[PDB]
Structure formats: C-alpha cells, structure tokens
Design a protein around this nucleic acid. Structure first.
Ligand SMILES: [Mg+2]
Ligand SMILES: [Mg+2]
Ligand SMILES: [Mg+2]
Ligand SMILES: [Mg+2]
Ligand SMILES: [Mg+2]
Ligand SMILES: [Mg+2]
Ligand SMILES: [Mg+2]
Ligand SMILES: [Mg+2]
Ligand SMILES: [Mg+2]
Ligand SMILES: [Mg+2]
Length: 95
RNA sequence: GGCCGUGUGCCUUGCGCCGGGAAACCACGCAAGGGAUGGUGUCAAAUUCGGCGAAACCUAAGCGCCCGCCCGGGCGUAUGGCAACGCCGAGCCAAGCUUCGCAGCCAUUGCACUCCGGCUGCGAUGAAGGUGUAGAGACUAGACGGCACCCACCUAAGGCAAACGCUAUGGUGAAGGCAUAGUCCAGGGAGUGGCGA
RNA sequence: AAGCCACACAAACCAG
RNA sequence: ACGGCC
C-alpha cells in the first residue's frame, strides 16, 4: 500500500521479459511528466527482476508520481509503487 | 615381416638436483636395461599461411696429410644432403567445461544501490588440447588423441572425528598418430633429361 | 657425388 | 627411422 516519504520510489510487479536498457527508456520519459528525474536502477537478477528504482530531484516529483501512476497498466501488468524503504546511495552522497 | 647393429623418443631401476608440491608425486642432468603400462562410454571438427632446430646414416667440392714434383689417384673431415623427429608467430576447430548475447521452458511478487538463478537451442569469446607436422597429398574410421565416468594403487592438505583415524576437488596405470589401422594416389622396383662437385 | 626438382612409365613386392 | 644380412 504505502510507506514513509523518500526521494526514490520502489516499483515492482513489472513485466520481467523487457530488457534492462529498454525498460529504462520506458521509465525516464513516463515519470518526468511530474518533475526532473535522476538515475534509474534496474536489474535482471532472480532477486531484482520485475523491480525498478526511480530517483527524483524533489519529493514533489515523487509524491505526485505515487498517486497519479499507482496501478497504471504497464505492459499488461498493474504497476505497484511504494516509497523506498531506505535512502539511495545517490542522495546520501549529498545530504 | 624375420635376425643383427646405430641413432632418437619412452618407461622401469640407480644416482644425482633440491626447482613446483602439504605429501604422494611431478620436473630437471645422466648411466644402464626392455620383465610390467586397467575398464566403459562419448567427440570426428578445424584440417590454413609462414618460421626456427635436429642426431644416426649418405656423400666428399673445399681444405689438411700423403703417393717426392704435374697428371692422376688415395686418406681424414661436413660447411652438402636425407631425415627419425624437438618446437615458435598468425589463423582456425568437434564435444566438454570459463565468461558474455539471443530464443524457449522451469521456477521467482522479490529493496537494491560492484557483478551475478537453473537447464536445453544456435552466436561469440576464455583456458586446455588439436591443426600447422604424411612418403608431396586425398578419403575412411577409432586410439595411443580430446572429453565424461569407473576401478586398482599411493599420499592426506583441506573437510569430517574427543579419538586409534576417515575421506580426493591431488597423484600414478609409457611413448608411438611429423598419417596409427585401412582405401587411395605419389615414390623405389623399372626410363629420359635439367641442377650438383 | 649424395641427393633434389620436370616429364614419361611393365608386374609381384618394399613402401610414411 | 637408419645401416647390414636372410
Ligand atoms: Mg616390454
Ligand atoms: Mg571425416
Ligand atoms: Mg663416415
Ligand atoms: Mg684433393
Ligand atoms: Mg609449415
Ligand atoms: Mg596434413
Ligand atoms: Mg596429427
Ligand atoms: Mg611415425
Ligand atoms: Mg599407415
Ligand atoms: Mg613419417
């Protein structure tokens, strides 16, 4: 459902078949209609498949992304989003 | 395809030698002999272009010595040659393993910030090994070759044991394939001419 | 010399 | 393999 505020958003239940370099371009464009986007982490590993992290510049870009994009059908799959359960290395090198 | 010799590769035994080993044992120098060298299964492809090295054996231009002197011969010798065979640079290669692509199935609903789940199908790469290396060479197999497993034997690092100790992912069971077993086709047996001394 | 290369080629056989 | 000899 929901967790506690964070710059990065945890997206799962994605389509596991689409390639790493292809999925990044399907994301960076689709979520920038809220604000500026930083980096996007995707791994194909047994543990990390069907999961993606999207890092924004401010909470405003992430909070609006959480509600307006929750459940949105992505490649015939209901995209589930949560707030990141831990701060990302990219942000923790600034704070 | 018999019996003598020569060389060279091979292993056993003996000595070195301390080089990799934890030990077994490999590796290196050499001397002498030929009594011993496990099993099943699996792969047949690449088979190209160059280059260095070679003994016994074959022969004697030059050279030295001699037949006193030239002509002639003779004696020794390879720097000429044949060649068992030892290899190097680039390429290339079946199966199996190293690591990445792409497809398919199997799982997986998973919180990460360094990379990563398992198989079967092609694709490329990595380490072996093979080709290059046959009498010029062509085609067939499987073995003595590659790969998997098994057994016999030796050792036991590590892992297991309180412990006498147990256990191999370690080693040993030769080389031959610079054509082995075979079909060819050269080559000699069996000619002619060129080069050479 | 020994051998090497080019044509030409009878048989068993020797033949890597 | 390379010399002999059968
Ligand atoms: Mg014997
Ligand atoms: Mg064949
Ligand atoms: Mg002589
Ligand atoms: Mg003279
Ligand atoms: Mg060659
Ligand atoms: Mg050949
Ligand atoms: Mg061969
Ligand atoms: Mg041979
Ligand atoms: Mg033969
Ligand atoms: Mg030969």
């Amino acid at each position: 459902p929901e967790t506690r505020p964070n710059h990065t958003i945890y997206i799962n239940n994605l389509n596991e078949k689409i390639k790493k370099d292809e999925l990044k371009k399907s994301l960076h464009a689709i979520f920038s209609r809220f604000g500026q986007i930083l980096d996007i982490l995707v791994s194909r590993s047994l543990k990390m498949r069907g999961q993606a992290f999207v890092i924004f510049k401010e909470v405003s870009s992430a909070t609006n992304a959480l509600r307006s994009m929750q459940g949105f059908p992505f490649y015939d799959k209901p995209m589930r989003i949560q707030y990141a359960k831990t701060d990302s290395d990219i942000i923790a090198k600034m704070k």
